Amino acid sequence: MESLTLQPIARVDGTINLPGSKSVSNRALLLAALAHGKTVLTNLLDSDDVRHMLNALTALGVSYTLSADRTRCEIIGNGGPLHAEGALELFLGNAGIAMRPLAAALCLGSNDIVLTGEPRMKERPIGHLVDALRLGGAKITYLEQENYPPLRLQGGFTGGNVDVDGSVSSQFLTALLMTAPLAPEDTVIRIKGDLVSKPYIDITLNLMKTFGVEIENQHYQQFVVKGGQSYQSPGTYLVEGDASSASYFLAAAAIKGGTVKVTGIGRNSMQGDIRFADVLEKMGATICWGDDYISCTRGELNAIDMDMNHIPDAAMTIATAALFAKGTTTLRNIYNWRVKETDRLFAMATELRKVGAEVEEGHDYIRITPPEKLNFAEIATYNDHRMAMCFSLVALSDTPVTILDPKCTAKTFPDYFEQLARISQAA
Numbered sequence: 072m073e074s075l076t077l078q079p080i081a082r083v084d085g086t087i088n089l090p091g092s093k094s095v096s097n098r099a100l101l102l103a104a105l106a107h108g109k110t111v112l113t114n115l116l117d118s119d120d121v122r123h124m125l126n127a128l129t130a131l132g133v134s135y136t137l138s139a140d141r142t143r144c145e146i147i148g149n150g151g152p153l154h155a156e157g158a159l160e161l162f163l164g165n166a167g168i169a170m171r172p173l174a175a176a177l178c179l180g181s182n183d184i185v186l187t188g189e190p191r192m193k194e195r196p197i198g199h200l201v202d203a204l205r206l207g208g209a210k211i212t213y214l215e216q217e218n219y220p221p222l223r224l225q226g227g228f229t230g231g232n233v234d235v236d237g238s239v240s241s242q243f244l245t246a247l248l249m250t251a252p253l254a255p256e257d258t259v260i261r262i263k264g265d266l267v268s269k270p271y272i273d274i275t276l277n278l279m280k281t282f283g284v285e286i287e288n289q290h291y292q293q294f295v296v297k298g299g300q301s302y303q304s305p306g307t308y309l310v311e312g313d314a315s316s317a318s319y320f321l322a323a324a325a326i327k328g329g330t331v332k333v334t335g336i337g338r339n340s341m342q343g344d345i346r347f348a349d350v351l352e353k354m355g356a357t358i359c360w361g362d363d364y365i366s367c368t369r370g371e372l373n374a375i376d377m378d379m380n381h382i383p384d385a386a387m388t389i390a391t392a393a394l395f396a397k398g399t400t401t402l403r404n405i406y407n408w409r410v411k412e413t414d415r416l417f418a419m420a421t422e423l424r425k426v427g428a429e430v431e432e433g434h435d436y437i438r439i440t441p442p443e444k445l446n447f448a449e450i451a452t453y454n455d456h457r458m459a460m461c462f463s464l465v466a467l468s469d470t471p472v473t474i475l476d477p478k479c480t481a482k483t484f485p486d487y488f489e490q491l492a493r494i495s496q497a498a
């Protein structure tokens with residue numbers, strides 16, 4: 072078991088040029104592969120999740136080239152739905168934003184493809200999406216547990232009236248939105264009830280428009296899509312820096328700054344996680360916005376009680392930052408933390424208690440009362456990049472912390488520890 076021990080960080084200050092957004096990167100790659108023309112993506116993220124999508128495209132016959140640092144990708148569009156037969160197996164690690172979009176996209180036309188991934192991916196739900204794809208005509212088979220990957224996709228999605236449950240993951244709707252335009256018939260996607268992680272739907276619509284397609288959004292309750300469309304290369308496209316990855320650095324400043332500036336995202340970003348900065352501001356930190364940066368300067372840190380459904384990923388960062396806040400912090404309406412890289416509510420509560428906090432693990436919320444002083448702990452990371460990055464913040468105290476399997480951060484941020492070290496100061 073590899074591990075990394077972080078010595079206490081007296082102060083953080085500096086600037087971080089953010090790695091590319093994972094959400095934008097994987098959407099851009101799939102749309103570029105489906106589009107007509109050559110797309111040049113810059114500031115693309117090089118991480119496991121993106122590497123799995125790239126490997127999937129390679130397996131499906133898509134041609135592309137990568138720069139030496141793998142952040143520039145020149146993709147030759149396929150000019151239409153991707154195809155493969157013979158139950159070709161695509162291994163997608165634990166990349167939700169590869170698995171969900173591909174599950175839908177590969178239902179166009181005929182195909183015989185199997186999507187699978189790491190053990191945990193076979194435990195992350197996909198039934199809501201499969202249900203919707205089938206209503207549209209797709210033939211999909213669960214090869215193991217009903218409602219979960221692996222899936223054997225044999226095509227047939229033609230369009231029509233499709234209902235989709237949006238209460239567990241917005242990724243299902245995202246997958247349908249990206250796929251429907253290329254279907255032969257018009258599609259009306261009706262959301263059954265609530266829609267969680269709504270801001271990610273906006274990311275999806277933004278990317279689709281960049282690639283030439285627009286749809287009719289009726290207050291997020293129903294989406295009217297015209298079929299028979301084609302995605303078109305936007306030429307050169309700049310992938311925004313990752314706002315979720317930025318949360319760690321901004322929070323570090325709110326806790327132990329100094330001023331930390333992250334570049335690659337700014338006030339105009341399409342990512343919902345830039346709203347994480349608003350939370351730090353509510354806690355007492357000072358935030359500065361620029362066109363291509365967001366900075367946070369230490370002020371004070373007070374506990375908050377907020378619905379975090381709009382920033383589920385970056386919200387985890389507030390859970391460990393809560394260790395340094397005055398009072399008890401409560402993060403609500405975050406049930407789907409349970410069906411992600413790991414069950415994050417169980418994982419976060421378990422590890423927070425190890426460093427001394429009193430924690431109520433609610434069914435869909437978490438309440439954290441910090442200790443007078445933190446204690447040393449060896450943190451388990453549950454093959455979850457964010458557990459490693461969230462707990463790295465424990466070192467912004469008088470105690471070191473040991474993080475197990477630090478390389479799990481490579482899911483979205485391979486250089487995480489070197490970047491945190493860059494802003495870590497002794498004086």
Ligand SMILES: O=C(O)C1=C[C@@H](OP(=O)(O)O)[C@@H](O)[C@H](O)C1
Pocket residue numbers: 093094095167168239240241242245267268271383384407411
């Ligand atoms: O669409 C996306 O890029 C993502 C949406 C979120 O999933 P849910 O919709 O299930 O919350 C998020 O947690 C995931 O890391 C990426």
